[PDB]
Design a protein around this ligand. Structure first.
Ligand SMILES: [Zn+2]
Ligand SMILES: [Zn+2]
Ligand SMILES: [Zn+2]
Ligand SMILES: [Zn+2]
Ligand SMILES: [Zn+2]
Ligand SMILES: [Zn+2]
Ligand SMILES: [Zn+2]
Ligand SMILES: [Zn+2]
Ligand SMILES: [Zn+2]
Ligand SMILES: [Zn+2]
Ligand SMILES: [Zn+2]
Ligand SMILES: [Zn+2]
Ligand SMILES: [Zn+2]
Ligand SMILES: [Zn+2]
Lengths: 208, 208, 208, 208, 208, 208, 208
């Protein structure tokens, strides 16, 4: 039965996550969580996904990704942490694509996860230099564009969420760019705004 | 149900505000309240906003903003406090734009919040030097212009409130500018009056 | 046909400007307007400019530059705004050089734009400190000298306009320099007057 | 034994204070006294505080703080002295919070120390300019509010002491504000009275 | 016999520390002390640790760590010294975990060592730039969290010590962050307070 | 023939200078003029310098250096312009050393060039901050010392010129240093006067 | 014979110093003098140092170090010059340790050299920023501590010289630290005074 096997997988994943978080090393915890997410996706593609077990699969993905976001908040080297965050987000997007999102609860869960991911990413990247900060923000913009192209649902709510996270990123960039000379400010602002306009056009094309 | 979830959110926000206000550090309190306001806006864009729960959402926003205004009155470094006040006001305006204001009670709530915000801003900026004071007043004028462009309602009452807060700012500026030489007075008065004329034109275009 | 393509470009530019000015962020509006001005110059150098379509090209340049000047008056960080104003003015001067000014109406349009630019520059730079203010005035003097070297027309009217804008700058500098000690006044006045004498010599050589 | 260790600590602290006060540099003396106060608090949180050794710990704190207040009266740069006084007062309040006040002798000791601190602060800040004077008075009001929120005891005596020190500060502010124009007087008086009303409300809430 | 071997190890370690401290090069002294600490831990895991020799092992660890802290105060390159301090602290925490802390004297010894370590770390990091200073403070927060997770004892005294060292770090950060613009202050304060809240939650979970 | 080749070089250099000066970019003009001066020195060391063509070579150097000084007065970034000015002066000194100065006309020419260089340097560096201003003045003192060590001629006239340019620098420094606190004034004045005494002693040793 | 070889070495070193000092480049002169000092130390360790040739070796060291101090006063990049000054001082201390100081004349010579070194170091470091200035002062304190640990002689005169140079450094630091905010002043003063107390303790241990 699909539902029973999905529930067994959920219990196994919960036990594995609880075991993993006990480690004191944050980078090791992130690596094990990334491996667990990949195994969950591999299990997803090897099983039938009907309308009964979809909620359980979404809950498994949410559990692993929430643990990963907390472990990222725990700390480490910012560049490595940001790279691992991007890899985990790509795996999560692939998993959501495989499973699919139908009901409103799953949409709410994945959107809350996206908001938390953006917040954690900005919090980690606060401590870089302005040029590396702008490069990281460009990478985050690409990731958000990919996520919103994959996801399907009500266009209006998705557009509202997209605009809100974009405002968050814009506020962070504007606050950070006050540490440099006006010429560097103009250069970096032009780069950021060109990328933002492009991703807005792409997302508006995909949603509507 | 929208109404039940909105009431649950209101109770949670009230509990969080009571917990936060107990801290003795005003800057930490302000930062936590700013984070809470952002989280409230995130929750707002993730749920349906019909005519039943709109009052509850406006009440949540008013609660958080009142707590923030009191914490700003508590004290700290004036420049940091003023910048945090501007950021909180921008988040509040975004939340009001998302929720929308329909009835008279919500309009009354947001207008009293604006009046209190202007009073607190002037009170905090009283202690700067004249040039930084005029720069802060220019920032406040831009914020008020943004607020009155976003808001919708009866044009006459909105115009009356706008004129009253403008008179408040003008009186504060006139009283402060008596500490400098007449040439500096002429320069700063010219800057302030040019900005005031521009914002009056913009607001009158937007309202009517 | 050159005239039809010029009119189509005028309509497209008007539509783009109207779309851009709806944004609430003044710095983003300025960046988009600068990009549009550069695109207009690119279009100008790629097409034939005879005596028929010259007026339309001058009107396109005037439209974009008027929108930029208003957006600059809207507000922002003074140093960044002044830097963007200088970049826009250089792009405008290059466009005028490419197109050329023959009739009296085009000369009137460009001279009015120059007067508005000087007024906006002084208004924005009012809020700096005296040393940065004097540096900004030096930059403005170099920009005005370049503009009057590029332009061709009746020497007497051009000299009258140049003298009037110089008097405006001198009045602003004299009013601002009353906030410092007499020794700093002597230093900054010496720097300003040396630069003014040099630019007067250069402009008088170029015009006659 | 707690009592014997507390008495040994008192003897060591007395010897250290006598050794430190022999230095001719007042700022260095203040820095060493701050370090000694921090070390005393560290010792306090690392040992048991019963009803036997509480008096000895209170006398240790009083000894260090009295030495600091005399050194602050000795002289130096007023802004640096005021900042060091505020830091020392906050450390003293933390130490009192850790130890606690039960008997009447300890209450009398700490209240006398607060009165001397307010007197020294007003004496040092007499020589600033009126705007910086009002800023320092606001900082002093916040410090007094924190002290009276931390302390526990008889509400009536505490309220009497609070009202008396408030009257002292008000008299100092009124006497100082006669050196400026009436408009500056109105602005600074409004700021001071708003802050005083807020702190009175907070203290009356905390005491009763 | 365990006790005799422990005392022989103590004498050998004392002789080695005295021999090492005679070197004039601070970085070389720190490296030799780190090697000696690692050797002591290796010896600890190779012998039986009962309730008789535990005090001697704790005294050996305290001796080596006190020598290391003094050598770190001696001087050198701030980044290298801070990195070596973190490595030595991790080795010390592992040694304390291996040996264990049972009586009150050992707890007092290790807590005094922690206070000294925090003071030395702040003193060394005073000379960095604000961004590197905040990064160092985050690393220190992680180190303190790991220490208080490893240690076992009376929850109340441990919590008091933890709160006091947190207040020390907070005062240092607040004093340092006055050298930057308010936007940078907001960014860095948000990062610091997020990390502080996370470590407070983790420590409160571990202790209770 | 040496004289004919020198005259041909003079004509070529005049043509090149006229061609270069037409550029509107001052920094590019300065870079080309520096390259031209270097090429002139290369040509000087590659040809015979008798008493016939010495005047022509001195005139070539004076032509290029006058063009460079005017281009420096035109404007740009003060730090870049000052550094380019120092390099150009060092190249000019090397050229004068290679060619040599024998008659009175050449001495008058080079001394007038030195006076103009000092005036332009002070004019450009008027707009820096006091610490960078004093650093630039120290660099100028080293350059003047090197120039007066290389040059040969009548000791009395050279000493008079050296004293006059020193008085100009001293007046500029004294007038600038009124914008800082008396402690900073004492520090910067001590540095400047130590350097001035050293260069005076060196120049008096070299001349006599 | 030791004395004849020492005198021959003195003559050779005098000739080499006279040849080197003729160079116009200060950094090249300083590097050459550093190499010469190293070669002198190499020669010192390769020959017998009895009581007859000790004076000549001390005179050789004094000659090279005086030339180096003058070259450092000549000028250059402050950071590079300070680093070269520290390296030269360390080589000089090694040479003094190898040769040894017995009579009163040698002690007077080396102490005069130390006073001149401290004066030159403070003069060069006057022009840095306050944070880099304090870092340089910390490095100078370590250098002085090493010097006074190596030297042997009458404890009272050595202590008097040490106290006097410490007062010179303290006066310089106090004068410089008036250019920053009181919080930065407190941080930097705490760092400086901690280091000064540590070096005073070390020197008092070494001398007595
Ligand atoms: Zn965590
Ligand atoms: Zn957000
Ligand atoms: Zn309050
Ligand atoms: Zn009002
Ligand atoms: Zn406008
Ligand atoms: Zn005008
Ligand atoms: Zn006294
Ligand atoms: Zn009183
Ligand atoms: Zn030490
Ligand atoms: Zn402490
Ligand atoms: Zn020129
Ligand atoms: Zn002159
Ligand atoms: Zn010299
Ligand atoms: Zn001295």
């Amino acid at each position: 039965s699909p539902l029973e096997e999905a529930k067994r997988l959920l219990e196994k994943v919960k036990k594995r996550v609880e075991e993993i978080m006990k480690n004191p090393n944050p980078v090791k915890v992130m690596l094990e969580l990334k491996e667990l997410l990949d195994e969950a996706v591999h299990e997803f593609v090897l099983m039938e996904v009907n309308e009964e077990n979809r909620e359980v699969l979404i809950e498994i993905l949410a559990t692993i990704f929430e643990a990963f976001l907390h472990a990222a908040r725990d700390g480490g080297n910012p560049k490595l942490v940001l790279l691992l965050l991007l890899e985990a987000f790509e795996t999560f997007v692939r998993g959501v694509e495989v499973v699919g999102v139908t009901s409103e609860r799953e949409l709410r869960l994945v959107l809350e996860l996206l908001v938390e991911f953006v917040h954690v990413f900005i919090l980690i990247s606060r401590l870089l230099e302005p040029r590396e900060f702008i490069a990281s923000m460009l990478e985050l913009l690409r990731a958000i564009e990919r996520f919103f192209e994959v996801l399907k649902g009500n266009p209006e709510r998705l557009l509202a969420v997209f605009e809100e996270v974009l405002e968050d990123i814009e506020e962070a960039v504007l606050k950070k760019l006050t540490e440099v000379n006006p010429e560097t400010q103009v250069l970096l602002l032009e780069a950021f705004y060109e990328k933002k306009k492009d991703v807005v056009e792409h997302v508006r094309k995909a949603l509507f």
